[PDB]
Amino acid sequence: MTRTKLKLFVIGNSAISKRAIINLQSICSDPKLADLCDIEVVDLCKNKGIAEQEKILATPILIKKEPLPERRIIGDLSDKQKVISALEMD
Amino acid sequence: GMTRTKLKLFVIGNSAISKRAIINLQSICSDPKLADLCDIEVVDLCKNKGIAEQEKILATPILIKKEPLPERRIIGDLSDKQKVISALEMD
């Protein structure tokens, strides 16, 4: 079927940044997700115009870019079913 | 009875919201009745790795009142003077 596009936006390299990335990779390891989800990690400090462009304040923030509508969730992604529900990835 | 108010504004780059937060903070601190000894430093997080985690920073722009204790903070472009003043407990 059609792809789900995920972008994880973080500030630098911290304890919370690291475990949000691991948690995302864990979530998308689900066989139902592993071949349909494309994930990018975006450091806000490495493209200086992104926080303004995506209107990002609080981080880490996971944004499901595709398919529309965009869905967002703030935090370290430590609750799988919470993330899936919030991003409508059921 | 003079006591220094120390403010640190942490931003990411030279975006519109960074610009807003900086000039808004400057306007807020321009009030001579607000603080005796108002000291402000603006930190670009992009050029200072490690600072974000040390200040528990997860949102930008963010303004942190280091002095006087206890530490207070507020997130955003600081476009509301009164919210900012009360949030940092500067009366």
Side-chain angles (χ1 to χ4, degrees):
Chain A
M1 216 193 68
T2 44
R3 320 282 299 164
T4 300
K5 191 208 177 327
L6 301 173
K7 284 196 171 196
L8 181 58
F9 304 87
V10 294
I11 293 176
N13 208 320
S14 56
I16 186 151
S17 169
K18 289 178 178 314
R19 77 173 180 266
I21 295 166
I22 296 180
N23 288 341
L24 176 57
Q25 293 173 344
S26 175
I27 288 168
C28 297
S29 76
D30 191 311
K32 185 182 176 297
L33 290 184
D35 291 329
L36 284 167
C37 293
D38 296 311
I39 60 190
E40 300 169 27
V41 174
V42 174
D43 193 328
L44 295 178
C45 297
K46 290 180 177 178
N47 190 341
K48 281 162 52 141
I50 291 197
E52 165 76 16
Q53 152 188 342
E54 300 290 347
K55 304 302 176 302
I56 293 173
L57 303 178
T59 66
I61 176 177
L62 182 54
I63 304 185
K64 190 187 74 166
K65 283 291 176 175
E66 300 174 4
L68 299 172
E70 280 194 22
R71 286 297 178 254
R72 304 174 165 222
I73 183 165
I74 319 287
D76 67 342
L77 304 168
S78 54
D79 192 321
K80 181 178 174 178
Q81 298 203 330
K82 159 80 131 289
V83 177
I84 298 169
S85 286
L87 303 186
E88 290 156 14
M89 297 171 63
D90 292 280
Chain B
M2 216 195 194
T3 313
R4 46 212 289 180
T5 288
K6 182 188 174 187
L7 297 173
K8 289 211 194 181
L9 177 61
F10 303 88
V11 294
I12 293 183
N14 190 18
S15 65
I17 188 168
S18 295
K19 290 195 184 78
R20 282 202 301 276
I22 294 169
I23 188 65
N24 283 342
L25 177 56
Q26 288 173 335
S27 174
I28 290 170
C29 296
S30 65
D31 192 344
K33 323 245 76 159
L34 183 53
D36 327 316
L37 227 173
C38 219
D39 255 288
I40 61 187
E41 178 191 8
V42 176
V43 175
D44 191 11
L45 288 181
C46 293
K47 299 174 177 177
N48 294 273
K49 303 174 161 51
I51 286 196
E53 185 163 21
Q54 271 298 305
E55 303 284 350
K56 292 162 166 288
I57 291 177
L58 291 179
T60 61
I62 188 172
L63 174 61
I64 303 182
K65 193 188 80 181
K66 305 296 244 169
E67 308 181 31
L69 297 177
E71 181 179 289
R72 295 302 181 220
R73 60 176 64 193
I74 184 180
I75 299 160
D77 65 351
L78 310 176
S79 56
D80 194 320
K81 169 174 61 172
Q82 300 305 139
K83 259 67 156 198
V84 172
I85 302 184
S86 81
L88 265 41
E89 308 199 359
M90 301 179 295
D91 313 12

